[PDB]
Amino acid sequence: TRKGIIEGEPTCCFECVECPDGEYSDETDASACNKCPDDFWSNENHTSCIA
Amino acid sequence: TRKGIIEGEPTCCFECVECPDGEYSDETDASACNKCPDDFWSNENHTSCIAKEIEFLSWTEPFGIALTLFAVLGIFLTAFVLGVFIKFRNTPIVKATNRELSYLLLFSLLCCFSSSLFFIGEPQDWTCRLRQPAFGISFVLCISCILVKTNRVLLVFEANLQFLLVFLCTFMQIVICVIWLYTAPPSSYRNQELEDEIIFITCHEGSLMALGFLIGYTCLLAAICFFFAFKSRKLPENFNEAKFITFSMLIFFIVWISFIPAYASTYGKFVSAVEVIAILAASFGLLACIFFNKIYIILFKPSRNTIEEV
Amino acid sequence: EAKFITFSMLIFFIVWISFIPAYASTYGKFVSAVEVIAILAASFGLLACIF
Numbered sequence: 001t002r003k004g005i006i007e008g009e010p011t012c013c014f015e016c017v018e019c020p021d022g023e024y025s026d027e028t029d030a031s032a033c034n035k036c037p038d039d040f041w042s043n044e045n046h047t048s049c050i051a
Numbered sequence: 052t053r054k055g056i057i058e059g060e061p062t063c064c065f066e067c068v069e070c071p072d073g074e075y076s077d078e079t080d081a082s083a084c085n086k087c088p089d090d091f092w093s094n095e096n097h098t099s100c101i102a103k104e105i106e107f108l109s110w111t112e113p114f115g116i117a118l119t120l121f122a123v124l125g126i127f128l129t130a131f132v133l134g135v136f137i138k139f140r141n142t143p144i145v146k147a148t149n150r151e152l153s154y155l156l157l158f159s160l161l162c163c164f165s166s167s168l169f170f171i172g173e174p175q176d177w178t179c180r181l182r183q184p185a186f187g188i189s190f191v192l193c194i195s196c197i198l199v200k201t202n203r204v205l206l207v208f209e210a211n212l213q214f215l216l217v218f219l220c221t222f223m224q225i226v227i228c229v230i231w232l233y234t235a236p237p238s239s240y241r242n243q244e245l246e247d248e249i250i251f252i253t254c255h256e257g258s259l260m261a262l263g264f265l266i267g268y269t270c271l272l273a274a275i276c277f278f279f280a281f282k283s284r285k286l287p288e289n290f291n292e293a294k295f296i297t298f299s300m301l302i303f304f305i306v307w308i309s310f311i312p313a314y315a316s317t318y319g320k321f322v323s324a325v326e327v328i329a330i331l332a333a334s335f336g337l338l339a340c341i342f343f344n345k346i347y348i349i350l351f352k353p354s355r356n357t358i359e360e361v
Numbered sequence: 362e363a364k365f366i367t368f369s370m371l372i373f374f375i376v377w378i379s380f381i382p383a384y385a386s387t388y389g390k391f392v393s394a395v396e397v398i399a400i401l402a403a404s405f406g407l408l409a410c411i412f
């Protein structure tokens with residue numbers, strides 16, 4: 001999951017937005033969703049890459 | 052495009068990240084992506100909601116035009132043969148084989164050819180309710196006419212009656228169709244489980260059990276016809292019509308056994324096309340393998356149109 | 362062997378035409394399976410009818 005902006009609120013106030021398919025997030029409090037490399041795709045849970 | 056937080060930097064500072072596929076952003080400076088609604092999909096710029104493409108076997112698709120052309124050819128050929136038996140109604144060849152059965156069979160072949168047309172176009176609820184029953188009933192009526200036209204078949208039932216055989220053989224499958232259409236009728240089903248940019252229109256059979264009974268009864272009748280025609284093929288009665296019935300049943304089985312892999316391995320609109328082809332093929336087989344020879348003798352080389360020859 | 366030649370070529374045409382709506386819209390292993398089935402059906406039709 002990535003962080004999303006609530007406009008009118010400080011930067012520490014974010015919402016959790018599911019990563020789109022093909023993009024993974026393997027960390028906690030990651031700003032953007034990381035794209036999988038070539039010949040690789042995001043899991044069902046979008047947490048890493050599987051070939 | 053949407054705004055993305057930079058680590059350690061205030062809200063005013065943000066990175067522009069293009070909208071994911073499927074979602075769109077209409078207003079500028081949007082903090083989040085909005086999923087396109089149902090029936091709608093993201094455009095090429097992720098800014099608008101383009102209606103998802105609707106896929107079905109179209110009448111203007113090359114497959115649709117071609118299969119309609121061939122079905123119309125079959126209709127014209129069946130009308131041709133029926134008109135030839137009407138013009139030379141009382142010639143010995145038309146008289147020998149029961150001509151009322153011949154008209155019934157040709158009407159049934161017209162119905163078989165016309166049943167394929169219920170597979171081209173956008174599937175409606177009544178269309179999906181009518182598709183399988185129509186071909187099933189029409190082709191069972193054809194097989195029944197052929198089954199009473201062969202030999203050692205009228206006799207075994209007797210131990211006219213021709214219409215009794217054809218009526219029961221069609222009526223059992225009509226009962227199947229009524230039970231199916233009353234209990235679990237088919238319908239039309241918009242699928243989004245295929246490619247997500249497309250809504251694909253299917254027919255939803257109420258139960259594959261009723262479809263299985265329909266197909267199995269249509270196959271059992273043809274198998275009985277083939278089995279009885281096999282033991283009569285050497286007879287030259289009615290211009291070797293027993294061996295020509297054998298040929299028609301063999302074509303039926305070739306067409307409907309080459310249909311299982313063709314149906315299973317087909318995905319998308321063209322699945323309906325598969326069915327059409329099979330239908331057409333079977334019908335054509337029957338027509339030719341039952342009629343054309345005789346028709347030739349009726350119209351060309353009429354010297355064989357004698358009681359001795361037939 | 363007129364009927365046998367005729368039915369060999371009928372099996373050929375019928376099998377290959379039934380697979381036109383499949384070959385037109387399919388991808389992956391199913392394409393190769395379609396090709397193998399068509400080849401095996403035409404070959405078996407010739408073998409059977411002729412011999």
Ligand SMILES: CC(C)CCC[C@@H](C)[C@H]1CC[C@H]2[C@@H]3CC=C4C[C@@H](OC(=O)CCC(=O)O)CC[C@]4(C)[C@H]3CC[C@]12C
Pocket residue numbers: 335339340343344
């Ligand atoms: C829709 C498309 C794909 C099919 C087009 C083929 C049929 C409409 C016609 C064209 C050739 C016809 C065949 C041409 C020749 C014969 C020979 C004929 O053999 C004979 O025993 C006749 C003997 C004689 O000539 O007196 C039997 C019918 C048959 C198979 C005909 C059956 C009907 C056929 C297959």
Ligand SMILES: COc1cccc([C@@H](C)NCCCc2ccccc2Cl)c1
Pocket residue numbers: 183186187256259262265266269270307314326330
């Ligand atoms: C073989 O004789 C027949 C008797 C009735 C109908 C038909 C054809 C025109 N449709 C088959 C229906 C195709 C089918 C098969 C399995 C599961 C779903 C579906 Cl959709 C042939």
Ligand SMILES: [Ca+2]
Pocket residue numbers: 008009010
């Ligand atoms: Ca504030």
Ligand SMILES: [Ca+2]
Pocket residue numbers: 059060
């Ligand atoms: Ca700072």
